[PDB]
């Protein structure tokens, strides 16, 4: 299923070769029928989440083809997961309409700090995947004030929610040095350069002291800003080495080199992707098995789900999805093989 999701993402990413919708829809029909003979769509859709997380970047898709394939999938799949993918699409659309509304508001009531372009793309928490609690990297003054005015606007209109700005994902550009070259940075690099600006001769510990830079994912970015840069060579460090522990002093240099005015460091995205639950899962499996054999209480279709979670003392341990999958796979032979048309007799209390 990971391979099928990879193939689907690869085909939909580049629609130039075979822009006709007929060949694409026949490929999708083949994929759908192949998935039909298979089961366990949970890993399939979490892989969808992984590929669409790393949609968050530039679209580079066809959109309407995704809508058609998700509609044809929902026709034969049902709800919940199909509804949350519909939530993905609805969230993206409502985000772009809210962005249009905010732009209209800025045009109507002029704000000087709105001169910088804002492309807020707020998401939802109940449907989108979660990565972690995210760090608290410092924001430069002007972007901080722009996000503050956006927060003030969003707290108006419809209330009852807040915005916890993240820093893992994001795309930004910066004008640098001499002809003015436009560089592409992704959040953390922007703050690093902003700190570099106000004073030269900045060392790594000084940067780490007041930027709240991450620890584990810092490794990918640290070895991406140097140690294998392309011919653009925007920035280099004087302690040229494969590893830089604590006191590698960084220096700002012109390094005009390439004449291109849209030098981008997006290539780091092409290389950063590379590279005890035992007791908990044993306890969960044992609890589910003892619940499924022991209960045997009078149920029709749902009160068994109530009593099984009643028996446990602590919650989030039941996880009704496991009960659902257990009772679904429990129909293989006589026990719990009752008639779907009338789900009345369920061995009653035996």
């Amino acid at each position: 299923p990971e391979y099928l999701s990879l193939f689907i993402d690869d085909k939909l990413k580049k629609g130039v070769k075979g822009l006709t919708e007929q060949e694409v829809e026949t490929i999708l029909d083949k994929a759908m029928v192949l998935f039909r003979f298979m089961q366990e769509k949970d890993v399939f859709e979490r892989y969808y989440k992984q590929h669409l997380a790393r949609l968050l970047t530039n679209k580079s898709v066809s959109d309407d083809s995704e809508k058609n394939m998700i509609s044809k999938l929902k026709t034969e799949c049902g709800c919940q997961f199909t509804s949350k993918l519909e939530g993905m699409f609805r969230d993206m659309s409502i985000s772009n309409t809210t962005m249009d509304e905010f732009r209209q508001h800025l045009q109507a009531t002029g704000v000087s700090l709105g001169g910088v372009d804002l492309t807020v793309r707020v998401l939802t928490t109940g449907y989108w995947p979660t990565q972690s609690a995210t760090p608290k990297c410092n924001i430069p003054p002007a972007p901080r004030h722009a996000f503050e005015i956006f927060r003030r606007f969003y707290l108006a209109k419809h209330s009852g929610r807040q915005l916890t700005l993240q820093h893992h994902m994001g795309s930004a550009d910066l004008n640098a040095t001499t002809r003015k070259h436009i560089l592409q940075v992704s959040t953390f690099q922007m703050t690093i350069l902003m700190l570099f600006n106000n004073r030269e001769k900045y060392t790594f510990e000084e940067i780490q002291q007041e930027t709240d830079i991450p620890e584990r994912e810092l490794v990918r970015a640290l070895q991406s800003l140097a140690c294998g840069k392309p011919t653009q060579r925007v920035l280099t460090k004087e302690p040229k080495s494969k590893e830089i522990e604590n006191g590698h002093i960084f220096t700002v240099n012109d390094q005009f080199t390439s004449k291109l005015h849209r030098v981008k460091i997006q290539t780091v995205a092409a290389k950063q992707g590379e590279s005890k639950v035992d007791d908990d899962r044993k306890h969960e499996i044992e609890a589910a098995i003892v619940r499924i054999m022991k209960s045997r209480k009078k149920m029709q279709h749902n009160v068994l789900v109530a009593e099984v979670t009643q028996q446990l003392k602590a919650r989030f341990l039941p996880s009704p999805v496991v009960i659902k999958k257990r009772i679904e796979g429990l129909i293989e032979r006589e026990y719990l093989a009752r008639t779907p048309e009338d789900r009345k007799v369920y061995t009653y209390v035996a």
Binding site: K136, N138, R144, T164, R199, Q209, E210
Partner: protein
């Protein structure tokens, strides 16, 4: 006529040098400015407080110096302490995130002084206004 502290602060905020010892220098200023006089002491303290609030000043140095300034606040008389508390709170409310570590302690001390003077309504509204759960 108490322009000595004012000129010292002015010389410090125009200091181009950002060496590590500067913070220590500021501490020296504190140990020469905690004790002085009456109303002009309040003037020096308010000039000090509005000196840290500038975004040009280093955030970590300003924050640590703000904690050092705050530790001596309870010894001040009630009225001056309340004035400085409200001044700090109104200076912090634009940039809440930059000083969202000691605002809780300042509000706690303010609420303690209110509850020790029977004025519970102001402490109640202050502790309503603190963004504890909403903060990341």
């Amino acid at each position: 006529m108490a322009a000595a502290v004012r000129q010292d602060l002015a010389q410090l905020m125009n200091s181009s040098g950002s060496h590590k010892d500067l913070a220590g220098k500021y501490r020296q200023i504190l140990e020469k400015a905690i004790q002085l006089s009456g109303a002009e002491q309040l003037e020096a303290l308010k000039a000090f407080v509005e000196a840290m609030v500038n975004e040009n000043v280093s955030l970590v140095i300003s924050r640590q110096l703000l904690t050092d300034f705050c530790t001596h606040l309870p010894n001040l008389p009630d009225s001056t302490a309340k004035e400085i508390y409200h001044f700090t709170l109104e200076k912090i409310q634009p940039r809440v995130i930059s000083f969202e570590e000691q605002v809780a302690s300042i509000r706690q001390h303010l609420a303690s002084i209110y509850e020790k003077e029977e004025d519970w309504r102001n402490a109640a509204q202050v502790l309503v206004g603190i963004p504890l759960e909403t903060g990341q």
